[PDB]
């Protein structure tokens, strides 16, 4: 067995001095960036005379000299305008000029005209301006028929023509190498020269790779060719992205981008060497920076390149890195005696870099956050390329005339081809540039970056090339209120006179501030930063080695008991640790000694309880390393999910610290003795989650971990009381689920907190079922279990980014989430497509033991998880469907693996068990029957998770409306719920709620709900009004109060934003529950019971064993659509919840009866008839509603 | 300005319904459209689908995306005031059908 | 004021929607109130006007 983390992440080369320098800046302060890039960029008061003056001639000469056009002549809308393109779009599609023409003048001049509008977005930003992430398709639509009847075939034609234009001459150079190395002879006589860039970046699959190596391959040859011996300079050069090249490039992938990567570059450059071209290495996302590095290196250093200095490399200077990437090529470049071609780019990626470093709660940006911190660190760059010409070759890729004067006189008057040249973009750049190429001009030459491609290769990533934004030069030149002085401000004298020089942007909050003053942030670690995996590697060894153990933990001390080992899940032979279990005795006695000291505890003031949750946070944030080794070699999870997992244990305990300040006081009395039960899959985050949240509502705790996973449990709990939390309020108990049923079955036990599987979960149920508190009610249960995880994708989804979002939703973890995708439903047209890049997908996951970064999926749980997957999986291939699965390593045979495995079902309905493992199932769908498929969904019985990928608001309104899911997930993954961001927990077979992580919770653990934070509701549910003016009319005066006060205090129609990362909307919604069952005694009972449920936007089914049916005589129609009457609870159902009347003879019947029910565990409530006279609050509105989050991917 | 019941028959004078009243064919007004699709409309085009009503079932989904009904429009006028423009549904339709796919047809027209 | 404003943007209205399918009804009878001589008169011919149809 090889020794744990012996291997984690072992750089591709030991890290020099240079390379140390860059790391060490990845998110520097950017006031500790700005200073040194201003000393290096500041220039003479007569050279910043003569820049600027060189800078306004320039934008003189552009403010001197199609779509607007368009709109003017016809006097379009900007929607249609918007459509016009897209129907233009669509006509381009039918290859055949003359069937096109003939359509346009017989069928689409006559009105009548996959969506027209799927690059709607796209044509907005070109119509607009704006950038919009979803499409109005209805609007739009509406627009395009306006149009047309309007203004017929001439319009139609216009639009035809502009868009050909545009997509076949503006937006690439042209759609093929060789119509591009056509187009490019005129510019090229002029004085430019060009670097082709084959539209095509994030390879899925092999073959993805494949077929961009062979693209990159011919288009060398045919570059080479037409560069007839011109050289690196005067001739035409390619750039490829390395992206494209392999599926898996990453610094986790690190050894395969080595070994499989590496060499296509060389053979690509060996082939650009024979022709003497120019071969640039574009520059994508700050997580492959330091990576791309290591591929430079290998490739100047390799001798059979020698001889040939086209090989190209961009720096972005918007990365804090940049000077220090700068250092080390400039450095290389001597080394190496290549004279390096060096891009200096500002970066094409800002947007995303700041959303992912929220995301990954880093410690800051490793881009700036002002736009005029990049342009001086770009005439900083600019200045240290300079000093270098006689090593690297220069290359200014800019369209900001201010930055462009700067360096030209920066630069000097002393110039020859070869020193260094200037670069823009193909269609962009060309107005500015042809003020600088030529002798009558500033006589500087311009490389030209020609996109060549198709229109649909086009129209992948065209929105991302146009944001290249109100911040950006080529938008402020074209903003009339923008005066010239303000584009030729010195950017470096600006910055040189602020307040605190290198400020963060004021309305950017750091990954640490993303909830301002109600919490703080948990912190990641990047596992991208080299400094961060040389010392992770030293602290997983260092927990691999600790003797890990779990014992009893009672009040009164360590308890004795049957102890035997835990063992790693992806490796038996690697001991974790030893747990002692708890006997059942010890456990009964642990509740007992949990009920002596629950006064003591309630006695804590919240705010001091709550400042216990604070300090384990402070904890187990100090202690993330150690706890990521033990809950990877514990609970068999890679080092991403388990900082992610450590993550969410301190945002449940700050979120839930936060939530108490917010709501606890004298008279919110604590329920008593909580048992909380702990599922495997998140061993420390729900463990963490549901005894903070009891713990901090003023209840001791009895902990009981998933047998599988104890020792990371016992940690947690040595976590807890080090923070302040008494051996009396905390006791750990360790062992199989006897120790759980004895915990649950004690009488002294005052609520249950469970989160695993169904079964358990109604085991739990029908024990609580047969007690009730002291008080006479319902011991409250939360049980949150399963879901059958569904996503529906349409024709207008980006395939990558759906086969991205998949493969991580029913793949990470092994597929052993809550929220993992179980069934992708795919649109006919688009299916075989999508399927075929997610099988090759499939094929690029690692999977193996999980010490070690390269793994990507590790082990199942356990055996009997393991068998009991696979015979799902064979059963299915028994069946007659198409299974995919990769094939395992000998290596896993010391574990328990199942490999990632795609199933392609007929129906939905094929699939009749919840299968807890790396297995996706998927089915195919005609457009028409998508309302039909959301039916089918529906039907199985769970509501937890659910995603939909499609661009059109007319489908993302219909599929979110009619879906019934605790969280939704729009155009992204479906997994790793945020607390406080996405509460997470779901309905039906999926849980009882309170959600997780949300504002309900701790309501749940207290005698008396307090009012959680903006938790109201302007809207009334006006079945409620009506049932208020019955009841009134019927001479039931009081309940008719009761009902206008249920109807007032009901919050059902809150509609709340939670604030979250940028790119990304988090809403927050409270919907009805469903049918409620009510189970009156008395007249009155039932009036308030129905004014209950009907102020929550419920429906009921009224248990007719009352024999209450004349109490409902002459009921409005509104309110009697809303009544049925129930003779056969289990026939009647599925319910969302009960209301019960009774003593506690009746209550106690009742609920054995309610808890025997198929279907959803009911969320019951009890009382008596006096309770209901004496207490307004008798049933609780809180739980008559459903809390609903929905998360928008809008990047 | 107009109303409903007792006080008109519609569309409202000044507003952007009112001209596609005096032609045969009306246009599309301007921001005349809805992402709303109304869900008994949806539940009646399955049922088409169900006893192979073909055309009809096409009929009822295209007038769901047809419908205006949920446009919720702010119009531009003085500060200091929200003018709000909102399409809702006009009440109960007397139907008086000749056929049943007539009635299939009116049946989607007014569920949508 | 409202009579202008009928005018302005009865024609506005034109201009963003009416084309050679909007065919006209024919004769239109326009009859007017007391309450709103000069502002109800000129929008119900108006429109009636700018949609194709002569006004009676
Ligand atoms: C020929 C060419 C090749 C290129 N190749 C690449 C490449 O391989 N990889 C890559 O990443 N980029 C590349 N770029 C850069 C990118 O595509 C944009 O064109 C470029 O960033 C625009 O910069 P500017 O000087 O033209 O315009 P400007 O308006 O001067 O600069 C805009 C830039 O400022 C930066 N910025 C905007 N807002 C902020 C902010 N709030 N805080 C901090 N910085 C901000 C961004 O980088 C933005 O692009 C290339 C550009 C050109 C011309
Ligand atoms: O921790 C368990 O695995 C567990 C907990 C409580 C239980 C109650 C009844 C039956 C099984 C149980 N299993
Ligand atoms: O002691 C146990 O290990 C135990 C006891 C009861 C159980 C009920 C359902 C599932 C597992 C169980 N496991
Ligand atoms: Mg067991």
Avoid at 140 to 167: F, K, N, Q, Y
Avoid at 401 to 422: C, N, P, R, S, W
Avoid at 479 to 498: G, H, N, Q, Y
Avoid at 731 to 754: H, I, S
């Amino acid at each position: 067995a090889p020794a744990p983390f012996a291997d984690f992440a072992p750089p591709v080369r030991p890290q020099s001095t240079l390379r140390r320098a860059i790391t060490a800046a990845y998110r520097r302060p950017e006031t500790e960036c700005l200073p040194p890039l201003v000393e290096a960029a500041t220039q003479s008061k007569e050279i910043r005379d003569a820049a600027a003056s060189t800078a306004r001639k320039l934008i003189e000469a552009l403010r001197g000299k199609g779509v607007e056009g368009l709109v003017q002549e016809y006097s379009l809308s900007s929607q249609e305008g918007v459509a016009l393109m897209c129907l233009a779009e669509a006509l381009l599609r039918i290859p055949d000029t003359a069937t096109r023409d003939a359509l346009i003048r017989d069928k689409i001049a006559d009105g009548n005209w996959r969506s027209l509008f799927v690059n709607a977005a796209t044509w907005g930003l070109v119509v607009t301006g704006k950038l919009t992430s979803t499409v109005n398709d209805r609007s739009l639509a509406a627009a395009l028929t306006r149009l047309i009847s309007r203004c017929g075939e001439p319009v139609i034609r216009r639009g035809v023509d502009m868009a050909m234009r545009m997509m076949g001459e503006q937006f690439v150079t042209g759609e093929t190498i060789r119509e591009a190395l056509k187009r490019s002879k005129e510019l090229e006589e002029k004085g430019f020269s060009y670097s082709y860039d084959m539209l095509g970046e994030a390879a899925t699959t092999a073959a993805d790779a494949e077929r961009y190596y062979r693209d990159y391959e011919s288009a060398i040859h045919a570059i080479g060719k037409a560069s007839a011996g011109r050289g690196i300079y005067e001739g035409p050069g390619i750039s490829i992205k390395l992206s494209a090249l392999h599926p898996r490039y990453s610094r986790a992938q690190a050894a395969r981008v080595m070994g499989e990567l590496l060499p296509r570059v060389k053979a690509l450059a060996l082939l650009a060497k024979n022709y003497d071209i120019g071969l640039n290495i574009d520059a994508e996302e700050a997580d492959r920076l330091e990576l791309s590095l290591d591929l430079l290196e290998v490739l100047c250093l390799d001798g059979d390149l020698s001889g040939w200095n086209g090989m190209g490399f961009v720096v972005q200077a918007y990365g804090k890195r940049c000077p220090f990437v700068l250092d080390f090529i400039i450095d290389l470049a001597r080394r190496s005696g290549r004279r390096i071609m060096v891009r200096l780019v500002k970066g094409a990626y800002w947007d995303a870099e700041i959303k992912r470093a929220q995301l990954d709660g880093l410690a800051d940006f490793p881009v700036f956050t002002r736009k005029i911190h990049t342009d001086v660190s770009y005439i900083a760059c600019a200045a240290k390329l300079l000093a270098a010409t006689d090593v690297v070759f220069p290359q200014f890729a800019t369209h900001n005339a201010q930055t462009l004067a700067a360096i030209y006189h920066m630069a000097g008057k002393d110039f020859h081809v070869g020193k260094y040249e200037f670069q823009c973009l193909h269609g962009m750049g060309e107005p500015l540039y042809e003020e600088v190429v030529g002798r009558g001009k500033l006589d500087r030459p311009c490389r030209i970056y020609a996109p060549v491609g198709t229109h649909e290769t086009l129209l992948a990533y065209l929105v991302r090339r146009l944001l290249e934004a109100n911040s950006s030069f080529v938008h402020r030149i074209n903003d009339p209120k923008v005066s010239i002085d303000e584009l030729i401000a010195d950017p470096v004298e600006v910055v040189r006179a602020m307040p605190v020089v290198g400020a963060k942007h004021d309305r950017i909050a750091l990954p640490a501030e993303l909830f301002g003053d109600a919490r703080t942030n948990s912190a990641g670690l990047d596992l991208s930063n080299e400094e961060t995996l040389a010392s992770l590697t030293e602290a997983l060894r260092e927990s691999a080695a600790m003797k890990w153990t779990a014992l009893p933990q009672l009040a009164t001390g360590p308890a004795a008991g049957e102890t035997r080992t835990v063992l790693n899940p992806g490796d038996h032979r690697d001991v974790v640790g030893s747990v002692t279990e708890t006997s059942e005795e010890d456990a009964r006695r642990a509740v007992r000694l949990a009920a002596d000291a629950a006064p003591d505890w309630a006695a804590v003031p919240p705010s001091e309880r709550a400042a216990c949750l604070d300090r384990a946070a402070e904890l187990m944030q100090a202690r993330m390393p150690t706890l990521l080794g033990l809950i990877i070699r514990e609970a068999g999870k890679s080092a991403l999910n388990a900082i992610a997992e450590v993550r969410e244990a301190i945002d449940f305990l700050r979120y839930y610290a936060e939530q108490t300040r917010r709501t606890l006081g004298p008279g919110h009395g604590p329920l008593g003795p909580i048992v909380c039960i702990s599922p495997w899959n998140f061993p420390l985050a729900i463990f963490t989650g549901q005894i903070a949240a009891a713990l901090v509502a003023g209840n001791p705790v009895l902990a009981k971990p998933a047998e599988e996973t104890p020792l990371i449990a016992a940690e947690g709990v040595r976590i807890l009381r080090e923070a302040g939390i008494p051996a009396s309020a905390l006791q750990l108990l360790p062992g199989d689920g006897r120790v759980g049923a004895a915990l649950v079955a004690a009488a002294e036990t005052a609520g249950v907190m469970f989160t695993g599987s169904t079964e358990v979960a109604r085991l739990i149920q029908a024990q609580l079922a047969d007690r009730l508190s002291p008080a006479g009610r319902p011991i409250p249960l939360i049980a949150e279990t399963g879901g059958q995880n569904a996503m529906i994708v349409d024709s207008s989804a980006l395939a990558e980014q759906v086969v991205g979002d998949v493969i991580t939703s029913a793949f990470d973890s092994a597929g052993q989430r809550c929220s993992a995708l179980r069934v992708l439903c795919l649109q006919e047209d688009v299916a075989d497509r999508i399927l075929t890049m997610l099988k090759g997908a499939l094929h690029e996951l690692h999977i193996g033991r999980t010490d070690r970064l390269s793994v990507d999926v590790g082990p199942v749980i356990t055996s009997e998880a393991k068998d009991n997957i696979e015979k799902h999986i064979e059963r299915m291939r028994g069946l007659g469907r198409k299974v995919e699965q990769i094939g395992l390593a000998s290596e896993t045979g010391v574990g328990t693996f199942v490999p990632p495995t795609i199933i392609e079902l007929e129906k939905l309905s094929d699939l009749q068990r919840e299968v807890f493992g790396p297995v996706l199932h998927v089915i195919r769908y005609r457009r028409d029957d998508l309302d039909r498929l959301v039916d089918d969904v529906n039907a199985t019985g769970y509501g937890l998770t659910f995603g939909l990928h499609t661009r059109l608001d007319e489908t993302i309104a219909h599929v979110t409306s009619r879906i019934k899911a605790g969280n939704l997930y729009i155009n992204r993954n479906i997994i790793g719920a945020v607390v406080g961001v996405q509460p997470f927990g779901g309905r039906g077979l999926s849980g009882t709620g309170p959600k997780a992580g949300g504002p309900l919770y701790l309501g749940r653990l207290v005698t008396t709900a307090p009012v959680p934070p903006q938790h109201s509701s302007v809207h009334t549910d006006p079945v409620l009004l009506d049932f208020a003016k019955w009841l009134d009319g019927k001479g039931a005066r009081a309940e008719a109060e009761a009902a206008r006060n249920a109807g007032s205090s009901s919050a059902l129609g809150l509609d709340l934003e939670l604030p979250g990362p940028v790119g990304e909307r988090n809403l927050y919604t409270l919907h009805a529950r469903g049918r409620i069952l009510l189970v009156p005694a008395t007249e009155s009972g039932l009036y308030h019971q129905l004014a209950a449920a009907l102020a929550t936007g419920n429906s009921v089914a009224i248990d007719a064993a009352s024999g209450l049916q004349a109490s409902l005589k002459n009921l409005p129609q509104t309110v009697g659509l809303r009544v049925s009457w129930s003779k056969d609870w289990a026939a009647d159902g599925p319910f969302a919840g009960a209301l019960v009347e009774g003593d506690a003879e009746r209550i106690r019947a009742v609920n054995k009866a309610i808890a025997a029910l198929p279907g959803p565990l009911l969320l019951v409530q009890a009382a008596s008839s006096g309770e209901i006279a004496r207490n307004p609050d008798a049933y609780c509105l809180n739980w008559l509603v459903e809390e609903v989050s929905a998360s928008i991917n809008t990047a």
